[PDB]
């Protein structure tokens, strides 16, 4: 950002979260991007610098699996990159030969790798609050 006075502060709303995530979806750059703390900081600071929303709104539910935004209106969630596992169906002594994915060394990283995905349903279904009502009272 170039040097200019900081635009006025205001709390994040359902509607701002909706409009900005729609903007991000239509402009590109975020859909399909690998999550990191640093990339999220950039996103938060950009929203802060352009619109004045204090960056304390963009929390996602804890893992593992899909992380849903606590802010109703924000239409991005974080989706694991590794394909979802088909738990069935374990064999006998030769299972390592038939299934190379079950060889020791092939295990997923202790920290789940995630990607930003747009989801239009987040505009009407507050998934974080369904999964975690304790976050809201």
């Amino acid at each position: 950002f170039p040097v200019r006075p900081q635009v006025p502060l205001r709390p994040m709303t359902y509607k701002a979260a909706l409009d900005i995530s729609h903007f991000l979806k239509e402009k590109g750059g975020l859909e399909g991007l690998i999550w990191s703390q640093r990339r999220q900081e950039i996103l938060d600071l950009w929203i802060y610098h352009t619109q004045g929303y204090f960056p304390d709104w963009q929390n996602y539910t804890p893992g593992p699996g899909i992380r849903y935004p606590l802010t109703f209106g924000w239409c991005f969630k974080l989706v694991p990159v590794e394909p979802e596992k088909v738990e069935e169906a374990n064999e006998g002594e030769n299972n390592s030969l038939l299934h190379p994915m079950s060889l020791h060394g092939m295990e997923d990283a202790e920290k789940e790798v995630l990607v930003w995905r747009f989801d239009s349903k987040l505009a009407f279904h507050h998934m974080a609050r369904e999964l975690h009502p304790e976050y809201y009272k």
């Binding site: 006025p8 502060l9 619109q51 004045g52």
Partner: protein, 60 residues
């Protein structure tokens, strides 16, 4: 209308709901709910939201 402001700095905004403007631009204020105001450019008639600290109210 009664309330006229002059821009003190360039305001670029990538968002269609904001009124972008140049330093020295004259605008009419349409709404003062909090610190993000709704405004119309005197020169283009284009309308949108503006950060009120980018602007100074003037007499007449």
């Amino acid at each position: 209308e009664d309330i006229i402001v002059v821009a003190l700095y360039d305001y670029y905004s990538p968002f269609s709901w904001d009124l972008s403007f140049q330093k020295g631009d004259q605008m009419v204020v349409l709404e003062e709910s909090g610190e993000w105001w709704k405004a119309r450019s005197l020169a283009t008639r284009k309308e949108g939201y503006i950060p009120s600290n980018y602007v100074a109210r003037v007499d007449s």
